[PDB]
Design a protein around this ligand. Structure first.
Ligand SMILES: O=C1CC(C(=O)N2CCN(c3ccc(CO)c(Cl)c3)CC2)=NC(=O)N1
Ligand SMILES: O=C1CC(C(=O)N2CCN(c3ccc(CO)c(Cl)c3)CC2)=NC(=O)N1
Lengths: 306, 306
């Protein structure tokens, strides 16, 4: 029993984190095989941050301008190239702790674990979701750029995020591991703002199923709504509309509890219109939307990893 | 910026988790040097759980009754002994991934990271606090016994908790690594209940300082209370009393924000008597008490580990 914000074990990722220094700028890099991945703005100075020309800045650099450290061992850079907003540093030594990995781009609403690092040293791990406005509500300080987000499928590490910058509203933006930004953001210190965020409805429903599994049932009722009558109320409260695919994803949770998806939607509709009236659900007084249906199944059924 | 439930990187602990089987019972073990630590109830059957005599049960066992697996490698048990509620299995191979470690017993109110495991395989990591009633609000399923809690100081792993059982109210109880239970619990399936829980006041104050650092200031005021006038209100709402040592611990947070501790206590006193009125603090509609003053400093100043 119980329900926690659970992150993946970070051991397989800790061994891939390195320190990358170019000039007086130092951030984190991802060392896989003989390639080190890091944000390309590591080659920027104070004069370039507002209007950088990464083509010019990179052409004026050589391999010896990049200092890469794996703990105390120095990695000799034997080549460099730029793929979108990510810099790829070819090194002479292949990382012997390279796990089975792949590069995946996630969708809004999906969750992943973040290994926050500083000077190539892991500092902490936490779970977060990609928001519908393509930002994440992370916890990052100065020097955290290059920190990566990941999921673990069986024995394979799926890298999905590399941290690049913090927006003025305190939220964070980054790219996938191919260098392509999540959302309409660019890696230059211009006045960029994120669009309006919305609540991930399918995640709230999955979180309500986790509550029923753990004994919280006070919000239930015997009513039933349709998918269109629910979406009319949901859009009023800035909730993402619910689709038939979302219903099918919630299948296993509905079977384990014996509560149909449209039944639970009627309970969520009541919680949106009347509030929670000082009561709590799984120790929260707000509706949580950063647990996917898979996160609930994994935590309420117990699947490990190799 | 930002504030998350952040756990320690679990890499150094993942390499110490093994699978321990005795009869038809399988749980997790901690492999440090040539010793494997696991809960002693692994030697119990169905007939013994309600009234076990661990002296008799252990004397009727031999070294070959214990099957220890580190992944696929089998560890030959060359000796066994019992220290309080923990079984110590001497094996022929010393764990080459043994980090610098120590065994520490934590106090109520302190936090630690939990590496939840099943069949010796890590499944997830999360942060939790030792409650004033010596339980933890964990997330554990069947087979999680032997999972350990830990903190990381510099390069040293401080083990502080080993999971033993879940109580009927859904909370969890365990021992330190010397086998001594936290709280008045025993490892037999009798009807045990935890005492009344209270809110960790010093942790709430530390969490309020984290909010001010991150831009949440709506709850502040210019009033100031005394330590005794605050404790009179706190005990009314089942809050732990505040001591002068708690004030000194909050020193660095008060200096960084320029808000005295007694000033913040006046704000907490108002939040307890009037509620939050539908407003949120750091994305929560409740007062969070599972962040220590050290957790806030570490996340709002960025200290890594070796
Ligand atoms: O999330 C964070 C990250 C963070 C941090 O280390 N930064 C801020 C972003 N910065 C940067 C430099 C150049 C360019 C373009 O040349 C860009 Cl776009 C960004 C690197 C240093 N500080 C925080 O406070 N929070
Ligand atoms: O936290 C958890 C742990 C858990 C779990 O694996 N257990 C439950 C406790 N159990 C046990 C066996 C014998 C004795 C004394 O002989 C005792 Cl005290 C406990 C071992 C198996 N299942 C859950 O659902 N939650």
């Amino acid at each position: 029993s119980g329900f926690r914000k659970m992150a993946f074990p970070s051991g397989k990722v800790e061994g891939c984190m390195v320190q990358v220094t170019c000039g007086t700028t130092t951030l984190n890099g991802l060392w896989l095989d003989d390639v080190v991945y890091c944000p390309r703005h590591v080659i920027c100075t104070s004069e370039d941050m507002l209007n950088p020309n990464y083509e010019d800045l990179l052409i004026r650099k050589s391999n010896h301008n990049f200092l890469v450290q794996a703990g105390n061992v120095q990695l000799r850079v034997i080549g460099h190239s730029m793929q979108n907003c990510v810099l790829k540093l070819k090194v002479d030594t292949a990382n012997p702790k390279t796990p089975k990995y792949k590069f995946v781009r996630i969708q809004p609403g999906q969750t992943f674990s973040v290994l926050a690092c500083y000077n190539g040293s892991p500092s902490g791990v936490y779970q977060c979701a990609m928001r519908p406005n393509f930002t994440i509500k992370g916890s990052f300080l100065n020097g955290s750029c290059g920190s990566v987000g990941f999921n673990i499928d069986y024995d394979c590490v799926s890298f999905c995020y590399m941290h690049h910058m913090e927006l003025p509203t305190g939220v964070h933006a980054g790219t996938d591991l191919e260098g392509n930004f999540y959302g309409p953001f660019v890696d230059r210190q211009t006045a960029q703002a994120a669009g309006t965020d919305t609540t991930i409805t399918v995640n709230v429903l999955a979180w309500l199923y986790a509550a029923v599994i753990n004994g919280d049932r006070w919000f239930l009722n015997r009513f039933t709504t349709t998918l269109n009558d629910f979406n009319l109320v949901a859009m009023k409260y800035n909730y993402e509309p619910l689709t038939q695919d979302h219903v099918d994803i919630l299948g296993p949770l509905s079977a384990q509890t014996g509560i149909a998806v449209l039944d639970m939607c009627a309970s969520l509709k009541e919680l949106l219109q009347n509030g929670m009236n000082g009561r709590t659900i799984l120790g929260s007084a707000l509706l949580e939307d950063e647990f996917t249906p898979f996160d609930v199944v994994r935590q309420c059924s117990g699947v490990t990893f190799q």
